[PDB]
Amino acid sequence: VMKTVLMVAEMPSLAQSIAKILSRGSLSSHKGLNGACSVHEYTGTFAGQPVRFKMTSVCGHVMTLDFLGKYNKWDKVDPAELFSQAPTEKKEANPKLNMVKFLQVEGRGCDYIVLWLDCDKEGENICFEVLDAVLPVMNKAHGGEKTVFRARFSSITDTDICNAMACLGEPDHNEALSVDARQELDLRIGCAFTRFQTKYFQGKYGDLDSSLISFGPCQTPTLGFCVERHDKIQSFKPETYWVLQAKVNTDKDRSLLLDWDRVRVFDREIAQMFLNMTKLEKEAQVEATSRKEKAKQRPLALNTVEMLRVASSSLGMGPQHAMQTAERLYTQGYISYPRTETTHYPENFDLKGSLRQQANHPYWADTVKRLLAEGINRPRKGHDAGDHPPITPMKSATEAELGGDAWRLYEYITRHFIATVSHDCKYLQSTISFRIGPELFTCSGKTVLSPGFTEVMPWQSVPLEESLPTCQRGDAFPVGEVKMLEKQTNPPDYLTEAELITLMEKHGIGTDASIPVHINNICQRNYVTVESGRRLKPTNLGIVLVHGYYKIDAELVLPTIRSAVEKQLNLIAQGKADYRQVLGHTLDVFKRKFHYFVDSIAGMDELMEVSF
Amino acid sequence: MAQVAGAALSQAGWYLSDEGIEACTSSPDKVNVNDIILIALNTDLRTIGKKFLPSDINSGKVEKLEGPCVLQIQKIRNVAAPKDNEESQAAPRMLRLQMTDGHISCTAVEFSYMSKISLNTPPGTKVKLSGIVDIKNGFLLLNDSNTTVLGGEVEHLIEKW
DNA sequence: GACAGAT
Ligand SMILES: [Mn+2]
Ligand SMILES: [Mn+2]
Structure with a gap:
């Protein structure tokens, strides 16, 4: 008499690490029917019974949200129809990875689920995306029981993972509903405004043919920052x-x-x-x-925002390039998870041993040996958001082993790590x-x-x-x-990428994994141009859009609506407000702004005639 | 015939002409130096006061202002700050007070420090200069030891900024 | 034909 318990992580690295920690080392690893996610099997104890443990991993979001047929068509539906009378369905992200069928076939005969996903808001949404695919495959419950579980964890140390396994809770449906409401609002608003603008400015101006003019809750305020800096620069009188x-x-x-x-x-x-x-x-x-x-x-622990700012300022890389390099380094095993908001080292983190690996490198051999011989300093206490530990090196690397651009990022991360442990x-x-x-x-x-x-x-x-x-x-x-x-007095200069990330972080525009993308999108849509010193200079198309929005409806550019809508959506997570009511009201509020935007579009057209 | 009003003024400042003093008397009963001072505080100086400051005071050839004199502030600007960020803390506050009597104008500079006079001091506020005040390059060097902010309330065009 | 944001 044995029972199978399935655990699902958000990434193969965490899956393997947690399996190795929990098994004390017994795991048998074999790849599943997707070529990217493996299954680690071992034997242990659960709920007072001997069980067989199967650890697997999803790769990010299993599902995204898209419109049904005849509504994804550009020229078949009015964009104003994309608010209420446009059905939305959850479809698969990365359909090459079967994902849903993989979970369904690995959940056959399972009697328990322990969701080891990320302990953030999107983590619970991915948990329920896993649950609606695995739940109808498992065996039937008997006499109540607690088949669905959720492990709360931030560190990937032995003690932390063992404590997380000893303390198991339940998933929160309200956070998933909040994330779903955010996705729906974002999809509908962005699609409607982008479709209207693209269809309007392409049939009137020949220069904007085959050019995408996109509106979004993040792209528009991100461009508005640069346009507002441009306004300061132009409306400046030296004294x-x-x-x-x-x-x-x-x-x-x-x-x-x-x-x-x-x-x-x-x-x-x-x-x-x-x-x-x-x-x-x-x-x-x-x-x-x-x-x-x-x-x-001394500096705090390194997070993705600070890494991006230093990469843009000193090293000279764009946020997207820095993120790609950090992801490659993380994949190869040189640095930890590269998308973190946490600046506080875990209590059980092994600072001394990690700093011991970087003792043979010629650049900082003397400093590390001095630190270990004469005692290290306690790192500063910062924010401890429970998603991921800060970016720290975990393998010794050399300029020969690494490249000419990954080494520079690795050198800063390891130099930052020693500084946090070092003195003042x-x-x-x-x-x-x-x-x-x-x-x-x-x-x-x-x-x-x-x-x-x-x-x-x-x-x-x-x-x-x-x-x-x-x-x-x-x-x-x-x-x-x-x-x-x-x-x-000297006039101010155009916004740098480092400065923009601070304003994006301060106003809650974008996330740790979306700040590089939003900066890159507005560069690809020819809204801003990157200049010397990683400066973002608004183009003519960028100025006319932000200026036109101010004339029509300012509530589309100010970097406060994103926080305002999130605060309203936060009521769903806390259970104070119903899911349907907030979604219906917020869409209705934005629907009338769209109709005002359409019937007052002559504001932008006045500013478009001068340039194009 | 006892103009004790003019007598008291000649000893306590407030250079006011005959028309000004007769227009600042709220009742033809008797001398009420206190209420004349109050009415002068509530009234603009440019139309009632006499002329006290020496001519060509805004240029050289004059070194000292002697005697207690009441003068009306008309404009105040923070010289150590730009016209844009008038409240900048990148430099110690220095105030350029445009000051006047009924006829002639003058300019004073906050030399040491004056907490009583602020950037939001209403125009029409009256200041008493006591003792010998140093005039350098046509500027009255004003510090906290020779400046008494008597206070006042006259119509505010500053409210429209 | 394209879209939003986010992982
Ligand atoms: Mn995650
Ligand atoms: Mn995050």
Whole structure:
């Protein structure tokens, strides 16, 4: 008398890791009838009975949502029909992977399910997508029982996985309903607006032929960020301001450049009087001296957003290229899961052993050996979103083993990892305040007492400056020259990819796995152009769209509707609001905006005539 | 015939012409220096006050302003901030106060620091200069030790910004 | 013929 228990993970890597951990090492692995997901079998104990365990893995979302027939046709239905009278069905993503039939055939004779999927919102939706395919295949329950299970986990360590297996719960249907409502709203709104815009601007302007003009809850605000930066750049008037600076010539060999306490003035005559009552002086007196000690704080654990920003800024890769390189490294086993929002190391994470692997590399051999011999530092405590542990290296790599572009990403990840474990940067901040007549000046220096994480990340260092001369109150130093400088305020530059990710993260536009895509889509639709310094410059098509939306209905570009709709959808997850009611109301609200958009489309057409 | 109103003014500032003082008296009963001061506070100075500040005060050839004098603020601008981000904290606040009496204008600069005068101080607010004030390059150097914000309430075109 | 977002 034996029973079979089926566990399903969200990815083959997690499936294999969890099988290896839970089996103590007994597993037999054989590929299934898909060529991409394997089955690991072993024998153990469940619910006080001996059971045979089968671990398998889905590959992301099993199903997506698409319209039925005669409605996917572009020229057969009015886009306004894609709100209420357009049936939607869940079809298979990656139909090459059979997925549904694979789960159905591996769930025959199963008596329990332990869903080991990701512990995020989309994880529960994938759990129910697995359940509606495996549940009608398993054996019938008897006397109640708890056949469906859910394991809550974030770390993939032995202790964490054992605790997760000991503490098993139930899946949440409300989160799945919330995700389904989000998918439905997004599909309907995007399809309707994109179809209308593409069909309108292609039959009127010959330049936009075979050009896709897409609207979405994320693409439009992402483009609006760049267009708003462009508006700041264009509507900028340089202003002239004067800065008064003086030089003091102690010990006949140096010349300290003093800074003016009142940083700037915007009045020529005021600057003139300030210079007038200062220039005809030859003795500068000392009024203050500071020797305050300060610390530069070590980085938090690496997440996908920070990795993308540093890749765009320093390394020089687009978000999509960085994500692809990180995915290849993760597949080959060099780094962990590359799509994380977590900046907090798990308590049971093995920092010391992972840092031990990177001891033979010539670049950072000395630092790692010093860290292990003289004790390591506790990493900072950050956000602990329960989806995935932060991006950390787990294999020693060399420039020969890796490529010319994966090595640069790997080098930063491993350099970041040592910095988090390393100490802080302690530096002195000397300041001397001078009285030249009625007016004051300061001279600020900086010297490094003990570099910490700086020696692993030399770019995040303290620049070397010569130590300011020793001097106390009452010391008088001859002053060489004081001169007024004329300066003008500089206009801001176009949004960089690093800056856009911060604004996308702040306003909740896109996810950890969708931020690279949304930036790439608006580049492919010729909305923005990538320029020097990874700057995103809006095109003529990008300006007319965002400007036209402001004229017609601002509620389509502001980066607050996405958070507002999500907050309404969050009520489904908490059980306060019904699923049908929120979906019906939100679609109805957007339906009348579409009709306003269609009947007031002359706003965009006015701005399109000038360019195309 | 006892113009104790003018007598008290000649000792406590408030240079006001005959027309101004007769127009700031709310009753033909007797001298009420307190309520004349109150009405002057509630009234614009440009139409009632006499002329006190020396001519060519906005240029050189003058070094000191002597005596206690009440003057009306007409405009206030933060010189150490751009016209766009007027509340920027990238530089210490410095205020360029356009100040006047009934006839002649002058400009003052916040030298040390004045918490009493702010960027939102309403135009028409009145300030008393006490002691000897230093005029450098035509600018009155104003600090907290020679500036008394008497306060006032006169019509606000600033509300329309 | 295409679409949305997200994994
Ligand atoms: Mn996931
Ligand atoms: Mn996520």
